[PDB]
RNA sequence: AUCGAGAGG
């Protein structure tokens, strides 16, 4: 019934937790706040596979 | 003696309005025996109700506002804990300033 | 053979999914009043159908019986308590020498089972007993 | 902040709690293992040496015993294993670290420590299992529950320190709280649900149950009360037997709705000279209400008579309920077939009222009212239409519930339940809401990818037509799960915010003490109030009472 | 606002009046405007009321906002507890805050001030300014382990 | 020590209310068309029905522990077939020369209105009810 | 037949008797089912000494299972409580010693039943200590299971006790007990949707009592005197001897109060 | 500053004894009782050092006096014989 | 706990004779309070007692799957086919007196779980014991025979009571009280104290 | 780790008398009897028989805590009737019904053929 | 991990019934509810003792040591 | 053990709320409470 | 001891 998917380090079973992040190489527009000198921002975070 | 007269002033309005002469005799037909007893319970129950010196009340006051706030949860004004955090912080840029004019 | 597709969250913005495959059935009264109220879909430009709507849940909330009749934080509260329940975590518990292990003497498969339990092997490795429960008021304990 | 303003302490204990109906209010059920561990230094005197010498002889491994012995030289004699732990001969001026015993004063604690009424003193009652036991009617100031909570126990080590718990921090002294100027403790749970069933006009008690019910009151005059029925059979009223627990000299007048002195529905309450006259006892009478029976007896008789009053109501009502019984089950969530028809057609005509308004805004026939947009007037008129329809279904459900419906009986007693719990379980759970609005358009112009774009219908924006008895549809599940998550985050976020608020409050006002000239000052001596509360009163023994001179016509004032 | 007001008979009656509620605040120009009652005007922004209408009017406006967030939830607190808090925010010159820049910058000794926030930074300037502590604070005696002048220690005990 | 009231009444309306073994009663004094009563009555014991006409008595005797009847040595005060014990709590002056009595028999209630018991009933704890067929 | 309580037996078997108890008050027939559960004594295992155990179970797991086995105890009155006898730990006047040893010789799975328990101590001619077997295949209760190469060897002491101390010493299973099937004394308030009569089911004992006439009012002073019981036994004590010892232990228990009054 | 006493005729503090000076009076007495001190009341079968002082107080035999302080530093001494209890 | 967020510890253990019972002699393994039902709105717990009851009698499995056409009305028909009352109620008798319970009790099998929190792995008491090295305060944890913490939230609770003399003893005589010699000129603990 | 041994439910120990008898205060012919190592099987059977004695005024029992197997029994009697004789007659009156019940069942079981 | 001796609730033994129940299912080709009725188990407290039981003992025997 | 193997962490404008996109990819109910509620999600 | 992770109300 053991499903696997885990490691063994020094006899202790260990799991890698999935890590959630925002994707790179996407294009998003943000309304800046009311006391901001600029009105808007288009952003991209450029990543490389 | 002025501060003493100021402090009991609301209570005496309750006293005279209920220990009034038509009221004592027609509404609840007291005898002289019962009336003199009521004058002695009231003087005791009041003098027992006086606060005791040494009572730390600011901690009592702070806890007495603190606990009902922990049970607070939810017509478009800042209510509850953000308003309560607005009030206590002397927040200048409060989220819903309003003006009730008459 | 092109009978099933993999859809992520982005591609699912351009599709229309049914629920039961009975929604794809053409229909043109006498109903069970005790049965719940499903609206007729009134939309028919379907591209996909859900496999089963009960597959939106994880492995812990799939243990829960009748979670559609439950206020939804209770399903959350239960889903963290099923990881505290005691049972047979592995059939080789006697061989393994873990730091802590708790095993039920006489585990029982539940009398009320999710249909997703069979893929979770709960009826093969259960973690509770079917206790005879009386909801009663009796001495006040 | 962590080693001076608060630190870890000796003579402390903590374990899981549960409740005991056969415990008094000021008592705490201390386990024997905790009692054998906790000591109190007792100096030997002629009044105590005959008990203490037997205690030392009884040894640390059973109760009651001692653990150490301190001579005038000041060297501890360990009784766990010494040569002379059996032949000791006590000298005056010596200390015996004896066990915590019955009716010792201990401080009982529950965390978080918001109230003064969360760190109250108790009487020790050494009991033989693993849990901490306490009375049922002390949960509310502690905010305790027997779901897995632990509570801390605290032992004093000086004679005036023991006097400090019993004469200030004791449970009966804290029955009326300065916060809210009202009692914090009242009859709860099965005592409350049974005291309504017992006090019905139709509830009559036979002689055999009566005699057991009289002896169950711990203080008792031995006077069998005269039965309220004589000739066909000597029956008793449930009001007649309950009034034995109410001490004589108590008056309680209260009127609700149509409180004729005929009282056709047995509303209100009239208690005269420790005897009840008319009225079903429920939460208003015997709860923690202002002007309640607990508020009376704590003033009229005293604290110790009110603390003893809790058990005598508990021991009688629990016994009557033990032999009567109570339950719930699904059957008290089922309403009538015709009532289900009236609910499922009520929601349908609410589905028509939203469609017709939506088509009205679709054709731009809108009276642009001032201050809000065209969309904002649409959203308010659909949210309000759907909250009206959920309530109209629940009020349609509460009416169909008969007098024997157990959820209704818990609502009537005030033990557990509210209107909305009847409505969501049996009528319609209602309309879900994230961030205050309706269900948002998380997908592009839709809520779920099973709906067409631009669909502002009730079922597309989180309205749950079905009930918990009926069963939510899978879209209705996810919108409900969306709504409940906000409440889980709100519970999780408000808790850390409110703890920082209360700490800033206490750390600002911590030296505020009524001085001996009654002027509220601080550590520096600066005046804050000249009279505390501007009248110089303690907040307990202050009750609301109408000023009769204000209000009313000038004509009726004069007459 | 269906306000209750005395009838000419003397009894109280409900008198519905039209009331304007705004979405912004400037006190000093709105209250000097014809058509309104400038004796009844009310701002939820109590800090503005402090500088238009005196500090004593800010205190009673501060209490009315605190009382409303409790009464919004349905709870009750006695007057003396809120008004105690409301007085301490007010009993100085202006509005003194319950945050680290507010009461903890007062003249309240030193060691009590270091028990709340900016623990080490307060004790630094206290040694540089050569502060002297009265040691009448609760927190100073809690730290020192002495019996603080609380209710039991307010007085002294003496032989006859 | 003796009888304190005697009359015969005819019933008008019997009302169960929310209860299942008690009924509120509404009846007028027969051969005395100016006095009426209102009383709460156990109906599983004495099933008072509509169009009945029944006698009513109030005694003052015939504190101390209620001992059960040992035998016939303990003799009744009643050829009657329904008896309660109660307590006066108020006396309402309806008008000048018109009075009302208020009785609770452990929550079972009674209101009695007329003006010839002015010499009889009093603000005393003691009260008995007696009703004959 | 005799003055007082009267019994008419409806049905009987080796395994259960169905009977009617009549002209008895209520608290008696209650106090009879209470002693029939847990104050008449039996013999069961109360100490297990283990030698080897290569099985997949734990020793306390099988030791708990061993005590739950029904052993014969018809002649238990000749056997004395071990705390009352003067032996050092256990003798033949106060105890019974069983033994159990098995080996997985077969490649097939080898079971262990309660017939494999072998008595060792001197029985001294009383019907005592035989494991109860009502299984129609001769085997007993299935205690353990063995693999090829696994063995388990232990000795068990069986003592005297009551189910008040542990439920293994329980000679009975379930005491069916219903009085007044028609609800004529109004001892309970039925819960209903429309008709309490159509909702709730007619009990089987409704046949043995008269149907009430709706015109006649509530009998206000009748009490309950006629109770319907079905006592089921495990097999350690035969069914007739459950109630008879239940009667007798109730008799024996009152007399201890009576002789304690004499000592006062 | 230099002897900040108060004459007994001019005393505005409460004639009644506060609970906070009762519990210290009852406590300090039960302390010195527990370390073996004489007792000024016929103890009708009572051994508890607190219960002695509670019965010692209803007969007003405790020879102690509360030095009630004022915020300027002045004080008013009140003997337990003067102080009322309720 | 059950499978529906309903937690709860054990208040008391009752033997089977003290326990209430049905007319077939069936005894509850477990007794829970009805007051923990309406505020929590765990209706599926209540439907579990129905479907499991029919499951044990019929010898079938209970299809408690979500999003099915399984109704409380459809379950209850099957229960009345088995001679029990459709809403799960059963007449119960008191175990003490033997008198019938006036209320009929919702009775059935229900899946219940055993959680890792057991009292005997939680009981902790401490008179005197080991101290920490630097702070000279009691150590942390039952597993090291430690002390409970009298936090500032709990000190805040002691000022409201005015228990001034308890609060000193529990801040000093009950942990890390200590004595140092100081000088009258330099007001610091820089004096040297040769004691004997 | 704290549960008392299960034999304490029915084994007297350390000089615990089976019966303790104490006179009732503010009462006449009234006495209370702390029974020991006993439960509802014996207490509800004595009290139900005391009510059948016409010269018995009051009879009631209670368990002050279900942790412990003990109960208290209070009897009030007619004057000139020692309450111990009311208990003694009723204790003896129980056994007559039981002995007749045992004889009646045995007659019926011997008549039964299975 | 194996058949309990008796039902928890009532105390009627059930351990003698396990091997027979499986032959009523397998060999006699019977459904479950009639199998539990053939074994003399008529109370549902008894009846859930055998129906809901998972015989994990057969998986423990597969490990060789 | 199955639940521990399919669990995501979200280290840190409304991240905790059950978003509409989570349908069929993330369990709506199963998530921890209090400290980091909603950030920890189960597949 | 420190630093972590998980967990309970
Ligand atoms: Mg909890
Ligand atoms: Zn022997
Ligand atoms: Zn120096
Ligand atoms: Zn069973």
Structure-token pair, residue G171: 């000679």
- Cite residues whose beta carbon is less than 7 Å from strand M: C 80-81, 83-84; D 111-112, 145, 147-150; I 7, 117, 132-133; L 9, 32-34, 36, 40
Burial K15-51 (b: 16+ CB within 10 A, else e): bbbbebbeebeeeeebebbebbeebebebbbbbbbbb
d(CA D445, CA D452): 8
Q: How many other CB atoms sit within 10 Å of the CB of residue A42?
A: 8
Work out how many domains chain H is built from and give that number: 1
Query: Do residues I63 and C111 make contact, with C-beta atoms less than 8 angstroms apart?
Result: no
- The distance in angstroms from the start CA to the end CA of chain B is 40
d(CA D364, CA D345): 29
Q: For residue B57, what is the nearest residue in chain I, using CA coordinates?
A: I160
Query: Do residues J40 and J72 make contact, with C-beta atoms less than 8 angstroms apart?
Result: no
Structure-token pair, residue H73: 């530093």
CA of D340 to the centre of ligand 3 (A): 89
CA of H73 to the centre of ligand 2 (A): 83
Query: Do residues L5 and A3 make contact, with C-beta atoms less than 8 angstroms apart?
Result: yes
CB neighbours of J75 closer than 8 A, spacing ≥ 6? J30, J31, J33, J50, J56, J58, J59, J83, J86, J87
d(CA H43, CA H51): 9
Annotated binding site of I for Zn(2+): 183, 186
Please list every residue in chain C whose beta carbon sits closer than 8 Å to the beta carbon of residue L4: 83
Number of H helices and E strands in chain C, helices first, is: 1, 2
The alpha carbon of residue I157 is apart from the nearest alpha carbon of chain B, in Å, by 8
d(CA E17, CA E123): 57
Beta strands (DSSP E) in chain B are 99-101
Helices (H), chain E: 27-30, 46-52, 55-73, 79-88, 119-128, 138-144
Ligand nearest to the CA of I186: 3
Any idea which residue has 């492995």 for tokens? C59
Range of the domain at J109: 1-114
Query: Do residues D187 and D311 make contact, with C-beta atoms less than 8 angstroms apart?
Result: no
Q: How many other CB atoms sit within 10 Å of the CB of residue D555?
A: 10
Any idea which residue has 């899946």 for tokens? I111
What's the Å distance between residue D149 CA and nucleotide M8 C1'?
A: 8
Any idea which residue has 């004499």 for tokens? G262
Question: What residue ranges define each of the domains in chain K, with the CATH number in brackets?
Answer: 1-65 (1.10.10.60)
Quick check: bond before D112 cis, omega within 30? yes
d(CA K19, CA K17): 6
Phi, psi of B66 (to 5 degrees): -70, -45
Helix (H) or strand (E) holding F105: strand F98-105
Rounded to 10 degrees, the C-alpha dihedral I10/I13/I16/I18 comes to -110
Phi, psi of D399 (to 5 degrees): -75, -35
Q: Do chains C and E touch (3 or more CB pairs under 8 A)?
A: no
d(CA G117, CA G154): 10
DSSP of D436-472: TSSS---BTTBSSTTS-SS---TTTTTEE-S-TTT--
Among candidate residues D502, D144, D542, the one with its CA nearest the CA of residue B64: D502
Which whole-number Å values give the CA distances from F97 to B29, F6, F114, F116, in the listed order? 20, 20, 9, 9
d(CA J95, CA G31): 13
Query: Do residues D281 and D414 make contact, with C-beta atoms less than 8 angstroms apart?
Result: no
Helix (H) or strand (E) holding D118: none
- Angle between the G26-38 and G239-263 helix axes, to the nearest 10 degrees? 100
Walk across the sheet containing D275-278 and list its strands.
D251-254, D269-272, D275-278
Q: In whole angstroms, how large is the CA radius of gyration of chain D?
A: 31
Strands F36-42 and F108-114: antiparallel
Please list every residue in chain A whose beta carbon sits closer than 8 Å to the beta carbon of residue C122: none
- The distance in angstroms from the start CA to the end CA of chain F is 24
Please list every residue in chain E whose beta carbon sits closer than 8 Å to the beta carbon of residue H70: none
The answer to whether the Cβ–Cβ distance between H27 and I162 falls below 8 Å is no
Which whole-number Å values give the CA distances from G197 to G182, G190, I82, in the listed order? 10, 9, 17
We report the CATH number of the domain holding residue H70 as 3.90.940.10
Walk across the sheet containing G118-119 and list its strands.
G42-53, G151-161, G96-103, G118-119
Q: In whole angstroms, how large is the CA radius of gyration of chain I?
A: 30
Experiment used for this model:
X-ray
Q: In whole angstroms, how large is the CA radius of gyration of chain G?
A: 24
Q: In whole angstroms, how large is the CA radius of gyration of chain K?
A: 13
Mutation target among H20, H22, H27, H73 for the E interface, most CBs of E within 10 A: H20
Q: What DSSP character marks residue D536?
A: T
Q: What is the 3-state secondary structure (H, E, C) of L7-43?
A: EEECCCCCCCCCCHHHCCCCCCCCCCCCCCCCCCEEC
Which whole-number Å values give the CA distances from G248 to G2, H37, J97, in the listed order? 17, 63, 12
d(CA F112, CA F110): 7
Please list every residue in chain E whose beta carbon sits closer than 8 Å to the beta carbon of residue D552: 10-11
Structure-token pair, residue G44: 């069961």
Please list every residue in chain C whose beta carbon sits closer than 8 Å to the beta carbon of residue I67: 52-54, 68
CB neighbours of D548 closer than 8 A, spacing ≥ 6? B17, B18
Q: What DSSP character marks residue B78?
A: -
d(CA G8, CA D136): 48
Instruction: State the nucleotide closest to D144 in CA–C1' terms.
Output: M9
Instruction: State the nucleotide closest to C83 in CA–C1' terms.
Output: M7
Among candidate residues G200, D214, A19, the one with its CA nearest the CA of residue L11: A19
d(CA D273, CA D251): 6
Instruction: State the nucleotide closest to D145 in CA–C1' terms.
Output: M9
Query: Do residues G54 and G149 make contact, with C-beta atoms less than 8 angstroms apart?
Result: yes
Any idea which residue has 């559609």 for tokens? C68
Helices (H), C1-141: 72-81
Q: What is the 3-state secondary structure (H, E, C) of chain G?
A: CCCCCEEEEEEECCCEEEEEEECCCHHHHHHHHHHHHHCCCEEEEEEEEEEEECCCCCHHHHHHHHHCCCECCCCHHHCCCCCCCCCCCCCCCCCEEEEEEEECCCCCCEEEEHHHCEECCCCCCCCCCCECCCCCCCCCCEEEEECCCCEEEEEEEEEEECCCCCHHHCCEEEEEEEECCCCCCCCCCCCCCCCHHHHCCCCHHHHHCCCCCCCCCCCCCCCCCCEEEEEEECCCCCHHHHHHHHHHHHHHHHHHHHHHHHHC
Among candidate residues E113, E61, E112, the one with its CA nearest the CA of residue E82: E61
CB neighbours of F23 closer than 8 A, spacing ≥ 6? F14, F15, F16, F17, F40, F41, F43, F48
Burial D3-15 (b: 16+ CB within 10 A, else e): ebbbbbbbbbbbb
Q: What is the 3-state secondary structure (H, E, C) of D123-164?
A: EEEEECCCCEEECHHHHHHHCCCCCCCEEEEECCCCHHHHHH
Cα angle vertex G231, ends G225, G232, to 5°? 165
Contact J109/D at CB under 8 A: no
CB neighbours of I68 closer than 8 A, spacing ≥ 6? none
d(CA C34, CA I73): 6
d(CA H16, CA C78): 57
Nearest to F45 among D232, D265, D270 (CB): D232
Query: Do residues G258 and J90 make contact, with C-beta atoms less than 8 angstroms apart?
Result: no
Which whole-number Å values give the CA distances from D123 to D54, D386, H33, in the listed order? 23, 54, 22
Query: Do residues I35 and D415 make contact, with C-beta atoms less than 8 angstroms apart?
Result: yes
What's the Å distance between residue A47 CA and nucleotide M7 C1'?
A: 37
We report the CATH number of the domain holding residue J10 as 3.30.1360.10
Q: What is the 3-state secondary structure (H, E, C) of chain J?
A: CCCCCHHHHCCCCCCCCCEEEEECCCCCCEEEEEEECCCHHHHHHHHHHHCCCCCEEEEEEECCCCCCCEEEEEEEECCCCCHHHHHHHHHHHHHHHHHHHHHHHHHHHHHCCC
Q: How many CA atoms lie within 13 A of G102 on its CB side?
A: 20
d(CA L24, CA C54): 9
Phi, psi of K55 (to 5 degrees): -80, 85
d(CA D357, CA D181): 49
3 state DSSP class of C95: coil
The alpha carbon of residue D515 is apart from the nearest alpha carbon of chain B, in Å, by 5
For domain I131-196, the CATH class is alpha beta
Helix (H) or strand (E) holding E42: strand E42-43
Contact D552/G at CB under 8 A: no
Among candidate residues D45, D291, D313, D254, the one with its CA nearest the CA of residue D159: D45
The alpha carbon of residue L25 is apart from the nearest alpha carbon of chain C, in Å, by 7
CB neighbours of D265 closer than 8 A, spacing ≥ 6? D257, D258, F17, F18
Rounded to 10 degrees, the C-alpha dihedral C68/C69/C74/C76 comes to -10
d(CA H64, CA H28): 10
d(CA H57, CA H41): 10
CATH fold of the domain at F1-133: OB fold (Dihydrolipoamide Acetyltransferase, E2P) (2.40.50)
Query: What are the beta bridge partners of residue G227?
Result: G21, G179
D145 is in an annotated binding site: yes
3 state DSSP class of E28: helix
K45 is in an annotated binding site: yes
Query: Do residues D169 and I163 make contact, with C-beta atoms less than 8 angstroms apart?
Result: yes
Contact H67/D at CB under 8 A: no
Q: Is H77 exposed, middle or buried (0-12, 13-18, 19+ CB in 10 A)?
A: middle
Which whole-number Å values give the CA distances from G189 to D241, D275, F25, G200, in the listed order? 21, 28, 24, 12
Phi, psi of H51 (to 5 degrees): -60, -25
Helix (H) or strand (E) holding D314: helix D303-324
- CA–chain centroid gap for G78, Å, is 19
Phi/psi zone of residue K34: left (φ > 0), alpha (ψ -120 to 50 degrees), beta? alpha
Question: What residue ranges define each of the domains in chain G, with the CATH number in brackets?
Answer: 1-41+168-264 (3.30.1360.10), 42-167 (2.170.120.12)
Please list every residue in chain L whose beta carbon sits closer than 8 Å to the beta carbon of residue A17: 7-9
- CA–chain centroid gap for D408, Å, is 20
Rounded to 10 degrees, the C-alpha dihedral J41/J43/J44/J49 comes to 120
> Which bases on strand M have an atom closer than 7 Å to a protein beta carbon?
1, 6-9
Number of residues in chain B: 102
Beta strands (DSSP E) in H10-69 are 64-69
Q: What is the 3-state secondary structure (H, E, C) of chain I?
A: CECCCCCCCCCCCCCCCCCCEECCCCCCCEEECHHHCCCCCEHHHHHHHHHHHHHHHHCCCEECCCCCCCCHHHHHHHHHHCCCCCCCEECEECCCCCCECCCCEEEEEEEEECECCCHHHCCEEECCCCECCCCCCECECHHHCCEEEECHHHHHHHHHHCCHHHHHHHHCCCCCCCCCCCCCCCCCCCCCCCCC
D149 is in an annotated binding site: yes
- Domain covering D189-324: architecture: Orthogonal Bundle (1.10)
Q: For residue L18, what is the nearest residue in chain D, using CA coordinates?
A: D482
The alpha carbon of residue J49 is apart from the nearest alpha carbon of chain D, in Å, by 11
- Angle between the E79-88 and E55-73 helix axes, to the nearest 10 degrees? 140
Instruction: State the nucleotide closest to I134 in CA–C1' terms.
Output: M1
Any idea which residue has 């001085």 for tokens? D515
Structure-token pair, residue H81: 């014989």
What's the Å distance between residue C81 CA and nucleotide M7 C1'?
A: 11
DSSP of D8-70: EESSEEEEEEEE-TTS-TTEEEEEHHHHHH-EEEEE--TTTHHHHHHHHHH-TTSSS-EEEEE
């Amino acid at each position: 019934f053991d499903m696997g998917g885990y490691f063994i380090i020094n006899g202790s079973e260990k799991v890698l937790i999935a890590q959630e992040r925002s994707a790179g190489n996407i294009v998003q527009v943000f309304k800046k706040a009311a006391p901001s000198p600029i009105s808007h921002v288009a952003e991209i975070r450029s990543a490389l596979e | 003696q002025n501060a003493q007269r100021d402090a009991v002033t609301l209570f005496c309005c309750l006293l005279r309005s209920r220990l009034a002469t038509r009221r004592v005799l027609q509404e609840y037909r007291l005898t002289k025996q019962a009336f003199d007893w009521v004058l002695s319970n009231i003087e005791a129950q009041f003098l027992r109700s006086v606060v005791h010196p040494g009572e730390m009340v600011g901690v009592l006051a702070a806890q007495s506002i603190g606990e009902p706030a922990t049970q607070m949860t939810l017509k478009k004004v800042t209510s509850g804990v953000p308003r309560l955090k607005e009030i206590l912080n002397v927040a200048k840029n409060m989220k819903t300033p309003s003006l009730t004019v008459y | 053979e092109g009978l099933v597709e993999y859809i992520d969250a982005e591609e699912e913005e351009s599709i229309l999914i049914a629920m039961q495959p009975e929604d794809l059935e053409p229909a043109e009264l006498d109903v069970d009043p005790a049965k719940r109220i499903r609206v007729s879909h009134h939309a028919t430009t379907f591209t996909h159908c859900e496999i089963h709507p009960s597959m939106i849940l994880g492995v812990a909330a799939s243990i829960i019986p009748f979670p559609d009749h439950n206020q939804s934080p209770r399903n959350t509260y239960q889903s963290a308590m099923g990881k505290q329940a005691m049972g047979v975590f592995l059939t080789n518990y006697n061989v393994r020498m873990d730091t802590m292990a708790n095993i039920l003497y006489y585990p029982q498969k539940p009398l009320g089972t999710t249909r997703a339990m069979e893929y979770l092997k709960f009826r093969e490795l259960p973690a509770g007993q079917n206790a005879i429960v009386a909801i009663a008021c009796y001495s006040g304990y | 902040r962590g080693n001076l303003m608060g630190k870890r302490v000796d003579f402390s204990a903590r374990t899981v709690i549960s409740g005991d109906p056969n415990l008094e209010l000021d008592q705490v059920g201390v386990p024997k293992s905790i009692a054998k561990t906790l000591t109190y230094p007792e100096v030997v005197t002629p009044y105590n040496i005959d008990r203490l010498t037997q205690l030392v002889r009884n040894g640390p491994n059973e109760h009651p015993g001692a653990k150490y012995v301190i001579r005038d030289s000041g060297d501890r004699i360990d009784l766990r294993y010494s040569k002379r732990a059996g032949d000791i001969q006590l000298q005056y001026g010596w200390k015996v670290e004896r066990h915590i015993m019955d009716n010792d004063p201990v401080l009982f604690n529950r965390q978080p420590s918001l109230h003064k009424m969360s760190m109250m003193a108790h009487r020790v009652k050494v009991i033989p299992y693993s849990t901490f036991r306490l009375n049922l009617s002390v949960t509310s100031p502690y905010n305790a529950d027997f779901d897995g909570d632990e509570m801390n126990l605290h032992v004093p080590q000086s004679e005036e320190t023991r006097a400090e718990l019993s004469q200030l921090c004791a449970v009966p002294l804290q029955i009326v709280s300065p916060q809210s100027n009202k009692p914090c403790m009242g009859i709860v749970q099965d005592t409350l649900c049974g005291i309504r069933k017992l006090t019905l006009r139709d509830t009559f008690i036979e002689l055999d149950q009566v005699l057991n019910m009289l002896y169950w009151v711990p203080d008792w005059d031995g006077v069998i009360p005269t039965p309220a029925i004589i000739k066909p059979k000597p029956l008793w009223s449930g009001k007649q037997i309950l009034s034995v627990a109410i001490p004589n000299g108590i008056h309680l007048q209260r009127f609700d709705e149509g409180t004729t002195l005929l009282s056709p529905k047995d509303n209100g309450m009239l208690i005269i000279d420790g005897q009840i006259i008319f009225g079903v006892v429920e939460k208003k009478t015997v709860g923690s209400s202002n002007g309640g029976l607990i508020h009376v007896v704590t003033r009229e008789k005293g604290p110790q008579v009110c603390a003893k009053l809790f058990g005598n109501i508990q021991k009688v009502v629990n016994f009557w309920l033990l032999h009567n019984g109570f339950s719930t089950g699904i059957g008290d969530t089922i309403a009538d077939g015709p009532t289900m028809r009236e609910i499922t057609e009520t929601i349908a005509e609410a589905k028509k009222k939203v469609l017709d308004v939506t088509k009205e805004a679709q054709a731009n026939l809108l009276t642009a009212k001032h201050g809000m947009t065209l969309r904002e007037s649409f959203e308010d008129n659909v949210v309000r239409f759907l909250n009206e329809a959920r309530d109209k279904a629940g009020r349609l459900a509460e009416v169909n519930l008969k007098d024997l419906n157990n959820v209704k009986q818990m609502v009537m007693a005030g033990s557990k339940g509210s209107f909305i719990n009847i409505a969501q379980m049996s009528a319609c759970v209602g309309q879900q809401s994230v961030e205050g609005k309706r269900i948002a358009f998380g997908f592009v112009d839709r809520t779920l990818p099973h709906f067409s774009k631009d669909d502002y219908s009730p079922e597309s924006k989180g309205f749950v037509e079905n009930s918990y008895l009926r069963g939510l549809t899978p879209q209705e599940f996810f919108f409900h799960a969306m709504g409940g998550r906000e409440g889980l985050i709100d519970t999780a976020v408000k808790t850390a915010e409110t703890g920082y608020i209360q700490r800033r409050l206490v750390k600002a006002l911590e030296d505020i003490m009524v001085h001996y000239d009654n002027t509220t000052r601080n550590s520096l001596g600066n005046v804050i109030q000249f009279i505390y509360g501007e009248d110089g009163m303690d907040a307990a023994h202050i009750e609301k009472q109408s000023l009769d001179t204000i209000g009313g016509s000038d004509a009726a004032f004069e007459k | 606002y269906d306000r209750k007001v005395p009838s000419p008979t003397g009894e109280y009656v409900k008198e519905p009046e039209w009331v304007l509620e705004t979405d912004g605040v400037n006190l000093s120009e709105v209250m000097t405007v014809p058509g309104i009652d400038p004796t009844r005007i009310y701002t939820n922004s109590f800090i503005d009321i402090m500088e238009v209408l005196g500090i004593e009017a800010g205190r009673a406006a501060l209490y009315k906002e605190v009382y409303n967030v409790i009464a919004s939830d349905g709870s009750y607190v006695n007057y003396r507890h809120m008004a105690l808090l409301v007085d301490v925010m007010t009993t100085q010159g202006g509005l003194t805050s319950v945050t680290r820049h507010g009461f903890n910058r007062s003249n309240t000794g030193a060691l009590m001030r270091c028990s709340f926030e900016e623990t080490v930074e307060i004790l630094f300037e206290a040694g540089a300014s050569a502060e002297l502590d009265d040691c009448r604070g609760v927190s100073e005696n809690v730290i020192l382990g002495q019996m603080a002048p609380i209710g039991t220690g307010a007085f002294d005990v003496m032989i006859d | 020590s003796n009888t304190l009231f005697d009359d015969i009444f005819q019933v008008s309306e019997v009302d169960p209310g929310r209860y299942n073994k008690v009924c509120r009663i509404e009846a007028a004094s027969t051969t005395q068309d100016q006095c009426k009563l209102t009383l709460d009555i156990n109906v599983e014991l004495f099933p008072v029905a509509a169009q009945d006409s029944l006698t009513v008595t109030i005694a003052s005797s015939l504190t101390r522990s209620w001992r059960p009847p040992q035998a016939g040595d303990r003799s009744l005060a009643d050829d009657y077939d329904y008896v309660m014990y109660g307590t006066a709590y108020k006396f309402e002056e309806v008008s000048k020369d018109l009075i009302a009595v208020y009785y609770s028999f452990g929550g079972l209630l009674m209101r009695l209105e007329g003006n010839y018991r002015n010499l009889n009933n009093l603000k005393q704890e003691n009260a008995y009810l007696l009703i004959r067929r | 037949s005799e003055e007082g309580p009267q019994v008419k037996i409806r049905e009987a078997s080796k395994d259960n008797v169905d009977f009617i108890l009549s002209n008895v008050d209520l608290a008696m027939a209650n106090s009879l089912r209470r002693v029939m559960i847990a104050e008449i004594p039996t013999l069961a295992i109360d100490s297990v000494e283990v030698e080897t155990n290569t099985t997949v179970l734990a020793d306390e797991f099988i030791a708990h299972r061993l005590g739950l086995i029904p052993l014969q105890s018809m002649d238990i009155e000749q056997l004395e409580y071990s705390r009352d006898c003067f032996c050092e730990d256990h003798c033949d006047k106060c105890s019974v010693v069983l033994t159990l040893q098995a080996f997985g010789e077969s490649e097939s799975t080898t079971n262990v039943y309660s017939k494999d328990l072998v008595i060792v101590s001197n029985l001294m001619g009383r019907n005592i200590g035989h494991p109860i077997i009502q299984d129609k295949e001769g085997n007993g209760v299935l205690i353990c299971k063995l693999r090829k190469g696994q063995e388990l060897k232990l000795t068990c002491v069986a003592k005297k006790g009551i189910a008040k101390e542990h439920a293994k010493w329980g000679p009975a299973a379930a005491i069916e007990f219903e009085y007044d099937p028609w609800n004529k004394l109004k001892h309970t308030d039925y819960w209903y949707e429309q008709d309490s009569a159509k909702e709730w089911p007619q009990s089987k004992n409704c046949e043995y009592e008269d149907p009430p006439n709706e015109g006649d009012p509530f009998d206000y002073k009748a009490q309950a005197d006629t109770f319907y019981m079905n006592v089921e036994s495990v097999g350690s004590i035969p069914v007739d001897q459950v109630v008879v010892r239940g009667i007798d232990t109730l008799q024996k228990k009152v007399a201890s109060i009576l002789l304690a009054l004499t000592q006062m | 500053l230099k002897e900040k006493a108060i004459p007994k005729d001019q005393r505005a503090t409460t004639p009644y004894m506060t609970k906070y000076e009762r519990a210290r009076i009852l406590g300090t007495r039960a302390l010195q009782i527990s370390m073996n001190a004489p007792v000024f009341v016929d103890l009708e079968g009572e051994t508890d050092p607190l219960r002695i002082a509670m019965k010692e107080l209803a007969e007003k035999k405790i020879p102690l006096v509360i030095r009630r302080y004022l915020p300027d530093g002045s004080f008013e001494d009140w003997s337990v014989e003067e102080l009322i209890v309720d | 706990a059950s499978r529906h967020g309903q937690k709860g510890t054990i208040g008391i253990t009752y033997r089977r004779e003290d326990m209430p019972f049905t007319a077939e002699g069936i005894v509850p393994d477990l007794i829970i309070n009805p007051h923990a039902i309406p505020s929590r709105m765990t209706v599926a717990h209540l439907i579990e007692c129905l479907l499991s009851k029919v499951a044990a009698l019929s010898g079938n499995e209970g299809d408690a799957s979500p999003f099915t056409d399984i109704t409380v009305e459809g379950i209850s028909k099957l229960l009345r086919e088995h001679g029990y009352q459709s809403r799960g109620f059963e007449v119960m008798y008191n175990g003490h007196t033997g008198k019938k319970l006036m209320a009929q009790i919702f009775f059935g099998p229900t899946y219940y779980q055993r959680l890792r929190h057991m009292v005997d792995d939680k009981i902790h008491a401490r008179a005197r014991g080991p101290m920490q090295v630097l702070t000279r305060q009691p150590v942390e944890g039952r597993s090291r025979d430690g002390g409970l913490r009298f936090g500032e939230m709990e000190r805040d609770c002691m000022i409201a009571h005015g228990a001034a003399s308890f609060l000193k003893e529990r801040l000093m005589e009950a942990s890390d009280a200590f004595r140092v010699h100081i000088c009258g000129i330099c007001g610091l603990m820089t004096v040297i104290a040769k004691l004997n | 780790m704290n549960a008392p041994d299960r034999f304490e439910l029915f084994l007297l120990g350390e000089g615990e008398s089976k019966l303790k008898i104490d006179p009732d205060t503010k009462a006449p012919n009234a006495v209370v009897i702390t029974f020991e190592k006993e439960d509802h099987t014996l207490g509800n059977l004595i009290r139900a028989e005391l009510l059948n004695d016409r010269k018995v005024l009051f009879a009631a029992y209670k368990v002050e805590h279900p942790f412990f197997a003990r109960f208290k029994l209070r009897i009030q009697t007619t004057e000139g009737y020692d309450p111990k004789d009311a208990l003694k007659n009723a204790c003896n009156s129980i056994i007559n019904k039981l002995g007749a019940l045992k004889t009646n069942f045995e007659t019926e079981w011997n008549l039964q053929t299975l | 991990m194996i058949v309990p001796v008796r039902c928890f609730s009532c105390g009627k033994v059930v351990g003698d019934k396990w091997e027979s129940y499986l032959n009523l299912l397998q060999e006699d080709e019977l459904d479950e509810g009639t199998a539990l009725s053939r074994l003399g188990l008529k109370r549902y407290c008894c009846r859930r003792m055998i129906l809901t039981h998972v015989d994990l003992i057969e998986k423990f025997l597969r490990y060789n040591p | 053990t199955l639940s521990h193997l399919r669990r995501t962490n979200t280290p840190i404008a409304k991240p905790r709320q059950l978003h509409n996109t989570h349908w069929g990819l993330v369990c709506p109910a199963e998530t921890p409470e209090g400290q980091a509620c909603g950030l920890v999600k189960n597949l």
